[PDB]
Amino acid sequence: IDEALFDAEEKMEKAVAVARDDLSTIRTGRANPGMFSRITIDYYGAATPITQLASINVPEARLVVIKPYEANQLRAIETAIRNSDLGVNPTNDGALIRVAVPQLTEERRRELVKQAKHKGEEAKVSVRNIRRKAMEELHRIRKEGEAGEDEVGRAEKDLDKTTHQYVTQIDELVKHKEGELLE
Structure with a gap:
């Protein structure tokens, strides 16, 4: 009872x-780590969110730069974000990912x-x-x-x-x- x-x-x-x-x-x-947590990559045969494979610093309210835990993975991650419904353009300075969040x-x-x-x-x-x-x-x-x-x-x-x-x-x-x- x-x-x-x-x-x-x-x-x-x-x-x-x-x-x-x-x-x-x-x-x-206003970008935030939250929106990326549902996007995930094939990490060795199983899937895993970008949020366990990289750190997500949010500089401007309309910019997000990401730093993958492993530098070779950097690319697969960039692919993932480019595929998302988020409707966003990714870029990378070789070690990090630049992602400018367009206005809705x-x-x-x-x-x-x-x-x-x-x-x-x-x-x-x-x-x-x-x-x-x-x-x-x-x-x-x-x-x-x-x-x-x-x-x-x-x-x-x-x-x-x-x-x-x-x-x-x-x-x-x-x-x-x-x-x-x-x-």
């Missing part, structure tokens, strides 16, 4: 952490808004399933009489409040990203 509830809340908090991460990978004006085209903004909204919807749906799982658990507990009708009743109101609070937090992260996209 407490397990179903305390473990649900913790799952929710975790889904909100994941959502936050996922949303930060969204490309935007207006059409591309609305595009990425839709993406951010979708990630929210995804994370909110999963919070709701976490809740349904524990809610079905309390319903079980009430049927088999392993706690009083008043106990469970209280725990159902508490879960509902907790769920609402985390769904609301995900809408926040969305609205913030969407505002960040439109200036």
Whole structure:
């Protein structure tokens, strides 16, 4: 009864952490390491993100220079960024990669808004399933009489409040990203 509830809340908090991460990978004006973390290369038969194979210094708000842990790899990485949906032009001074992040085209903004909204919807749906799982658990507990009708009743109101609070937090992260996209 407490397990179903305390473990649900913790799952929710975790889904909100994941959502936050996922949303930060969204490309935007003001470059950041976040957008590169989803681009990855064939590193000896398995894949591996550019973010475990290189260091990502961000000089200007609209420039990013990268320093691969291994100098021969420098090229495969440059290829990766050139392939991304990020719509960016890579370059290299032989040991490092220069990447100037063009201004978002207006059409591309609305595009990425839709993406951010979708990630929210995804994370909110999963919070709701976490809740349904524990809610079905309390319903079980009430049927088999392993706690009083008043106990469970209280725990159902508490879960509902907790769920609402985390769904609301995900809408926040969305609205913030969407505002960040439109200036």
